């Protein structure tokens, strides 16, 4: 059949499992938007306020799905706003296909052309960047983008298609590749690696299992619970792993790291051995600025590139996390030293339950205070009173990150969402809409800073029009609080950190969202209830302090050290001059 390039793009997206499109109109995306109107996928298109906002919605959607189920489709110069959200998708292992419709290929390369987008600007960011030159390559390029996005590591793929190819027509026989099969990711380890891992776990005096986001992608929750109870070993997570182990369990120490739970950081500091499953041991995760001293450890990942890149393990294993844990459970009964004992009766149990008890006690102190300005831990205690096991907690980047991570007690995977890998401010609100779209039976609670919300609150348009009932708490301190605190620490003085807020209640109301301030009442519980009862997206304005959280609270972290001291650098004495220095010698 003769079809337009635009029709073929839509066909390819459908064929590879696309569920949601986030799209922006302009002359170069007109044929694509028309094609979409004639197809199933056309019923699910979000038109965002900005392309960057839309790109964050893709990331929030796909983060919780672990596939490229949301796809961006953008008019040429709109693609120029993608890079920040794309960089998060790359280091954060978020599958994300973006299709940019560039201007007419006939005008490419002409110096005075308009809206010829430099697609090569994505080469250092996307896991795959393709410029499509020929109509008969559109299906093949889209196929390749999805293979790349959904591989190990997951990440973003950018496809640049000059829009004249979307208007042109071609016979479609075999053009969109069909019948594609994927290899399983259930990679098994060799018996001897399994036995060695088991023997170390058994011989350790104070082992820990460290479960990262890979355990979530793996589906390894059930095997992890079994394993930990069988060996009687406390479980620490990364922030992307949090919730793969029920955080109300006695062996649950929570997440390690600089914004994590002190019980986890204590347990990591006390451990003599760690079994790491599905973690990349990253800079703002377990590495803490590459300061963390890891105990002897076994490291199991599906991505060989993360194994041994910085931390040298006792043993590295290329295996799926669930599968590895299943292999361990089978081998443990024939492992020298293993005794089947209730985890409560093991000798390491009391130390772990002590660490968790002290952390819980500290959290209870943080959340117990009444009144205004509010504790962000108190705000999270109120959320927990109305929270379901499938609900999603979203945060932005700032002081507020710490109380959000600390007051989230999670029972399922992929329920904690932010710009994890890159810490890009403004991510929260639009990632929350993305997650809501992907998970319509989850209530989505976002705790955002005021500096953060300033970025993409324009997307209340999308929250209102698509009836996405995200409950947003905006923590107001009229400051970039983390920056305030860190400057205060480093210099004893802050600069560029202070600003005015609008009447956020008034902003919400102007969009037709639910709005309420607790500034005078302190009634967070009632504000949450009325917000939930409205059925609308909601904004609850909650004044807090400039310093509570990431930059001040002691949770046992050791880094990252962003507060450098300098070094004195020797001048170059080799005899060569500086530019302009010739005039000094005259």
Ligand X SMILES: Cc1cc2nc3c(=O)[nH]c(=O)nc-3n(C[C@H](O)[C@H](O)[C@H](O)COP(=O)(O)OP(=O)(O)OC[C@H]3O[C@@H](n4cnc5c(N)ncnc54)[C@H](O)[C@@H]3O)c2cc1C
Residues contributing to the site for ligand X (CB under 6 A): 92-93, 114, 152-153, 185, 212-214, 217-218, 238-241, 255-260, 278-282, 284-286, 301-303, 306, 320-321, 397, 401, 419-421, 423
Selected range binding Mg ion among 89-97, 337-345, 420-428, 480-488, rule: CB under 5 A: 480-488
Contact flag: residue 121 with a copy of itself (CB under 8 A): yes
Could you tell which of a copy of itself, ligand TPP, ligand X, none binds residue 479, using a CB distance below 5 to 8 A set by kind?
Answer: ligand TPP
- The answer to the question of residue 23 lying near ligand TPP (CB under 6 A) is no
Q: Is the dihedral of CA 42, 45, 50, 55 positive or negative?
A: negative
The CA distance from 106 to 108, in Å, is 6
- Which segment (149-157, 348-356, 479-487, 554-562) binds ligand TPP by CB under 6 A? 479-487
Residues 9, 101 contacting (CB under 8 angstroms): no
- Give the long-range contacts of residues 190-198, CB within 8 A, separation 24 or more: 191/331, 193/315, 193/317, 193/319, 194/324, 194/327, 194/328, 194/331, 195/331, 195/335, 196/298, 196/315, 197/275, 197/298, 197/300, 197/315, 197/317, 197/324, 197/328, 198/328, 198/331, 198/332, 198/335, 198/338
Q: Does 350 bind a copy of itself (CB under 8 A)?
A: no
> From the CB of 378, what's the least distance to a copy of itself, in Å?
26
488 annotated ligand binder = no
For residues 94 and 62, the answer to whether their CB atoms sit within 8 Å is yes
Would you say 53 and 430 are in contact if contact means Cβ atoms under 8 Å apart?
yes
330 labeled part of a ligand binding site: no
Asked if 174 is part of the footprint of a copy of itself (rule: CB under 8 A), the reply reads yes
**Which residue bears the tokens 């039976």?**
441
Nearer to a copy of itself, 108 or 270 (CB): 108
Q: Edge to edge, what strands does the sheet with 444-449 contain?
A: 416-417, 392-395, 444-449, 471-476, 538-543, 514-517
Q: What is the DSSP annotation of 27-80?
A: GGGHHHHHHHHTSGGGGSEE--SSHHHHHHHHHHHHHHHTS--EEEEEEGGGGG
Among 248, 336, 441, 495, which residue sits at the site for a copy of itself (rule: CB under 8 A)?
495
Q: Does 43 bind a copy of itself (CB under 8 A)?
A: no
Structure-token pair, residue 253: 């120490």
Would you count residue 482 as binding ligand TPP (CB under 6 A)?
yes
If contact means CB under 5 to 8 A according to the sort of partner, which of ligand TPP, ligand X, Mg ion, none does residue 420 touch? ligand X
Tokens of 80: 């120029």
Candidates 205-213, 290-298, 301-309, 423-431; binding stretch for ligand TPP (CB under 6 A): 423-431
Q: Which does 67 bind (CB under 5 to 8 A by kind): Mg ion, ligand TPP, a copy of itself, none?
A: none
Give the CA radius of gyration of the chain: 26
- 171 lines the binding site for a copy of itself (CB under 8 A): yes
441 labelled as ligand-binding? no
| Whether the Cβ atoms of residue 139 and residue 197 lie closer than 8 Å to each other | no
End-to-end CA distance of the chain: 78
Q: How far is the CB of 234 from a copy of itself (least distance, A)?
A: 20
Residue 218 interacts, among ligand TPP, a copy of itself, ligand X, none and using kind-specific CB cut-offs from 5 to 8 Å, with: ligand X
| Site residues, ligand TPP (CB under 6 A) | 24-26, 51, 75, 77-78, 396-400, 423-425, 449-452, 475, 477, 479-483, 549
| Site residues, Mg ion (CB under 5 A) | 449-451, 477, 479, 481
Could you tell me which residues are annotated as the binding site for thiamine diphosphate?
A: 51
């Amino acid at each position: 059949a003769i079809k337009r390039g635009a029709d073929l793009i839509v066909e390819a997206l459908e064929e590879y499992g696309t569920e949601q499109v986030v799209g922006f109109i302009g002359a170069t995306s007109h044929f694509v938007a028309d094609a979409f109107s004639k197809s199933h996928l056309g019923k699910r298109v979000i038109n965002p306020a900005t392309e960057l906002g839309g790109a964050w919605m893709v990331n929030g959607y796909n983060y919780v799905k672990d596939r490229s189920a949301a796809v961006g489709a953008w008019h040429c110069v709109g693609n120029l706003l993608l890079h920040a959200a794309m960089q998060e998708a790359r280091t954060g292992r978020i599958p994300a296909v973006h299709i940019g419709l560039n201007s007419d290929g006939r005008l490419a390369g002409r110096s005075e052309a308009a809206q010829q987008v430099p697609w090569q600007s994505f080469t250092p960011i996307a896991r795959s960047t393709q410029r499509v030159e020929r109509l008969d390559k559109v299906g093949e390029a889209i196929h390749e983008a999805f293979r790349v996005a959904e591989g190990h590591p997951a990440g973003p793929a950018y496809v640049d298609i000059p829009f004249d190819l979307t208007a042109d027509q071609i016979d479609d026989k075999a053009l969109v590749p069909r019948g594609a099969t994927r290899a399983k990711s259930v990679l098994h380890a060799p018996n001897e690696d399994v036995r060695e891992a088991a023997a170390q776990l058994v011989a350790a005096k104070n082992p820990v299992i460290l479960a990262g986001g890979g355990v979530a992608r793996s589906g390894g929750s059930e095997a992890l619970l079994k394993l930990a109870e069988m060996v009687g070993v406390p479980v620490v997570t990364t922030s992307t792993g949090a919730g793969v182990f029920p955080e109300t369990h006695a062996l649950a120490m929570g997440s390690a790291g600089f914004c994590g739970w002190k019980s986890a950081n204590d347990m990591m500091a006390a451990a003599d051995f760690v079994l790491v499953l599905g973690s990349r041991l990253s800079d703002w995760g377990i590495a803490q600025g590459y300061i963390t001293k890891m105990p002897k450890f076994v490291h199991v990942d599906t991505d060989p590139a993360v194994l041994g890149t910085f931390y040298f393990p006792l043993l590295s294993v290329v295996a799926d996390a669930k599968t590895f844990m299943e292999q361990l459970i089978e081998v443990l009964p024939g492992t020298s030293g293993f005794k089947a004992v209730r985890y409560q009766e093991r000798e390491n149990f009391r130390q772990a339950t002590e660490f968790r008890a002290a952390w819980d006690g500290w959290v209870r102190e943080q959340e117990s205070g009444d009144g205004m300005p509010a504790s962000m831990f108190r705000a999270m205690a109120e959320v927990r009173k109305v929270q379901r096991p499938e609900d999603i907690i979203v945060t932005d980047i700032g002081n507020h990150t710490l109380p959000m991570f600390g007051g989230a007690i999670l029972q399922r995977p992929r329920r904690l969402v932010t710009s994890m890998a890159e810490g890009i401010l403004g991510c929260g609100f639009p990632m929350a809409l993305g997650a809501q779209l992907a998970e319509p039976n989850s209530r989505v609670f976002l705790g955002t800073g005021d500096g953060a919300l300033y970025y993409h609150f324009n997307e209340f348009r999308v929250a209102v029009e698509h009836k996405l009932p995200v409950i947003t708490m905006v923590f107001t301190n009229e400051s970039y609080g983390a920056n305030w605190t860190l400057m205060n620490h480093q210099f004893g003085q802050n600069n560029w950190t202070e600003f005015m807020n609008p009447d956020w209640v008034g902003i919400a109301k102007a969009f037709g969202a639910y709005g309420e301030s607790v500034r005078e009442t302190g009634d967070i519980a009632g504000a949450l209830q009325r917000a939930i009862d409205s059925g609308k997206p909601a904004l609850i304005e909650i004044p807090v302090s400039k310093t509570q959280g990431l930059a001040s609270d002691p949770v046992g972290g050791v880094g990252p050290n962003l507060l450098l001291k300098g070094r004195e650098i020797p001048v170059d004495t080799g005899g060569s001059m500086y530019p302009g220095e010739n005039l000094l010698h005259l």
